Design brief:
Blueprint (H helix, E strand, L loop, with lengths): L2 H13 L8 H24 L7 E6 L1 H4 L11 E9 L8 H11 L7 E4 L2 E6 L2 E9 L9 E4 L10 E4 L2 H10 L3 H21 L10 H11 L4 E3 L6 E3 L1 H14 L2 E5 L4 E5 L18 H22 L4 H12 L10
Parallel strand pairs: 2-5
Antiparallel strand pairs: 1-2, 3-4, 4-5, 6-7, 8-9, 10-11
Helix pairs in contact: 1-6, 2-4, 6-7, 8-9, 9-10
């Protein structure tokens, strides 16, 4: 294994967080929240003189896809779980259903809160986001998520077609074996870059699902196979360089009439329903800053390639990946 590749693999080992099926602690935190939901629904619906609805849970997010990273010091883990209630979407307002869930989790941890696409519970060190779905069998065979906040108007409270397991399947199935391993490593690298360089203004940070969808569209394996021995070596630095360049190539200067100027915009459609641009909520100014930081990262990947000393190559990378990127002592 080549030197800078060795450094990338060590970096990966430091940032990776084990997926649900390999992480008893995550499974326990998830299951504690789900048990609390069940008990709280018993109580909430007894107070209404009704039988509580049942739900089936399923894993979502980066810990379901084996792309999870550890948070930086002072950050929180983001546990994502979907719950499918045995209800018909046409019988209930979606924010009302989320209110059931929020009330059920009234006293669990540091309280609960209804967000646009989920109900969030808080615990020291992590939060659990519960995406709330209606039963497809009772709702016309489509899986719909409860969108809307308590303050949302009628047009913002909707049951939106969704496909989280299809997205998970697309990410799992794009590649296989060690190719898929490099794909997941590069997603993790960019998530740590995101956490390190978008910490001043978290609301301007690109969503992790947006980085993952971008990788789905544009990541390419970088490896070499020795023609005589068939030994295979991977080159994560080169894979990242090509991927970041392809992302940059897909920015488009977009005129904004209100501001009478252009902003660079990257559109990244989800590859499953509802096929939306994952970055659509980023402002033009946030996109300009995103592009500038991606460019600086690209320049660093290229500079790292041409350094004589491993120390200097790793320093150039740590300037963008943060202090857990290993930097060997200068001679």
């Amino acid at each position: 294994m080549a030197p800078v590749q060795k450094q990338f693999r060590e970096f990966h080992d430091r940032i990776k967080l084990a997926q649900y099926d390999e992480n008893q602690t995550l499974r326990d935190e998830r299951d504690a929240v789900l048990t609390a939901v069940r008990e709280g629904l018993k109580k909430v619906f007894a107070d209404r003189g009704e039988a509580a609805p049942t739900f089936t849970p399923f894993n979502q997010g980066s810990y379901a896809m084996n792309t999870g990273v550890k948070p930086l010091e002072g950050g929180e883990y983001d546990i994502d779980v979907g719950i499918i209630l045995n209800i018909a979407k046409d019988d209930h307002d979606p924010v009302e259903v989320k209110k059931w869930i929020r009330d059920a989790l009234k006293d669990y941890g540091n309280g609960a809160e209804i967000r646009r696409s989920c109900v969030t519970v808080f615990k020291p060190g992590y939060h659990v986001d519960l995406a709330v779905y209606a039963d497809p069998e009772l709702s016309g065979g489509t899986l719909c998520i409860a969108k809307g906040k308590e303050n949302s108007g009628d047009e913002h409270r909707l049951w939106q077609i969704s496909d989280p397991q299809g997205f998970q399947d697309r990410i799992a199935s794009k590649l296989s074996g060690d190719d898929a391993a490099q794909f997941r490593r590069c997603i993790r690298y960019l998530k740590r870059w995101r956490d390190f360089r978008f910490s001043s203004d978290g609301n301007a940070a690109p969503l992790g699902i947006g980085l993952t969808a971008a990788a789905y569209w544009w990541f390419q394996v970088s490896k070499r196979t020795d023609p005589v021995s068939q030994n295979v070596t991977y080159d994560d630095r080169d894979a990242l360089e090509q991927f970041v360049q392809t992302m940059l190539d897909n920015f488009h200067d977009t005129w904004d009439s209100k501001d009478q100027r252009s902003y660079p915009r990257l559109t990244v459609e989800l590859p499953v329903q509802p096929y939306n641009d994952v970055f659509e909520k980023m402002t033009g100014m946030q996109m300009e800053s995103f592009k500038s930081k991606l460019q600086a990262l690209l320049n660093a990947l290229k500079t790292a390639k041409s350094r004589l000393e491993l120390h200097d190559a790793c320093k150039a990378l740590a300037d963008h990946f943060g202090s857990e990127f290993p930097v060997p002592e200068k001679d």
